[PDB]
């Protein structure tokens, strides 16, 4: 006898991001289409020896939050955003891909207390509704990209318990978590931290690695199948792995990518580490030649360094390429769009998968049928005239 209520939590890369690039213009965003805005990112002053941002190496601020000048300027504009949407909640997200400092911040009673005091200071100075922690990743360290240790799992739980205790009542505490099956298994005690969190943002994207073609497929593709088992991911598979770990669906937001990736399979041999003499016997081989890589390079995407392509750029540069080099397709099993480019020999080559309005609506339908709490998306600056956010708002009744 009543309808559901859903979240739509939009990350916004305002300060700049390691993989997504320099920050966007906050003034472009339509904040009426979202329930929550995760302004990204605050960073962490840290003593990691490999830290290359010298601002973060200030020893007098160790374990506190760093806000760049652009982040501080953008956060000044919150009163304007709140007037636009009086129901909007605004959090600062701390961390992001490659962001150092969480392992050390979490490590001791003393370090945690410094970090928590800094969270409290920032929330009060900028009048935030809460804080989102995007630690990529406890225990795993993103495969050595940031410092990590096995104690990170338990220390993250302590940090969240203590931060929950320190936050004013009514403030929000949220986190983002990885797609990798090891995240709920080994990196993060999801069951243990659930009582401290308002909701959990699932990073159900960045799957176009190894032998997998699709970046954010809802279900596995059959036409374009992943070869190695350890690479075989889908948004639904990730959701089920988190549900198996004992999270309730209503606490979860399904992450949706407002971007695509050229699969690594296009340019790098795909290794199945479950095979004999694996590194010498790749199970997939690159199908881009210099011809294809040059097309992407000319558009500003150097595939030797990165594969990220914003949705707005997919629309302007790929779909609407004046030379008509890219053909749009739909994968009915995966429930997402993808583009092909024609090889010199005439064969369609899988160039990139992404999300469009139809696929965003299908992920909203999944949210509704699975009883998830809502959607999250990365990130609003990559939308095309706020269209994907609008589709999500419409589909979820925001």
Author numbering: 18 to 415
Reported in the publication:
A single-domain GH18 chitinase-D from Serratia proteamaculans (SpChiD) possesses multiple functions, including chitobiase activity to release GlcNAc from CHOS and colloidal chitin, and a hyper-TG activity with CHOS (DP3–6) substrates, generating long-chain CHOS14. Certain chitinases display transglycosylation (TG) activity as well as hydrolysis, forming new glycosidic bonds between donor and acceptor saccharides that can be used for the production of longer-chain and/or well-defined mixtures of CHOS with new or improved biological activities. Catalysis by glycoside hydrolase family 18 (GH18) chitinases proceeds via a substrate-assisted mechanism, which involves an oxazolinium ion intermediate and has a strong preference for a GlcNAc in the –1 subsite. SpChiD displayed an exceptionally high TG activity, in addition to its other inherent functions, and this can be exploited to increase the yield of long-chain CHOS for biological applications.
The SpChiD substrate-binding cleft contains four tryptophan residues (Trp114, Trp160, Trp290 and Trp395) with Trp160 and Trp290 flanking the entrance and Trp114 and Trp395 situated in the catalytic groove of the binding pocket. Half of the space in the SpChiD substrate-binding cleft is occupied by a loop (Asn30–Asp42), and the front face is equipped with Val35 and Thr36, which may provide favorable chemical interactions with the incoming substrate. Phylogenetic analysis of 131 bacterial family-18 chitinases revealed that all the SpChiD-like single-domain chitinases from the Enterobacteriaceae clustered in a distinct group. The novel loop and tryptophan residues were highly conserved in 18 of these enzymes, confirming their divergence from other groups. Therefore, Trp residues at the substrate-binding cleft appear to increase the affinity of substrate binding, thus influencing the TG activity of SpChiD. Mutational analysis also confirmed that Trp114, Trp160 and Trp290 are necessary for TG, and that Trp114 and Trp160 are the most important. The proportion of DP1 produced by SpChiD after 72 h was 96.4%, whereas the mutants V35G, V35F, T36G and T36F produced 54.8%, 96%, 51.4% and 59.5%, respectively. These data suggested the importance of residues Tyr28, Val35, Thr36 and the entire loop in chitobiase activity of SpChiD. SpChiD is active against polymeric substrates, which may depend on the flexible nature of the Asn30-Asp42 loop at the binding cleft. The ability of SpChiD to bind DP2 may favor chitobiase activity over TG activity, whereas perturbations in the positioning or binding of DP2 for chitobiase activity may increase the number of available DP2 molecules at the SpChiD substrate-binding cleft and thus increase TG activity. Further, we conclude that the substrate-binding cleft of a chitinase like SpChiD regulates multiple activities, and could therefore play a similar vital role in the 17 other chitinases present in the same phylogenetic cluster.
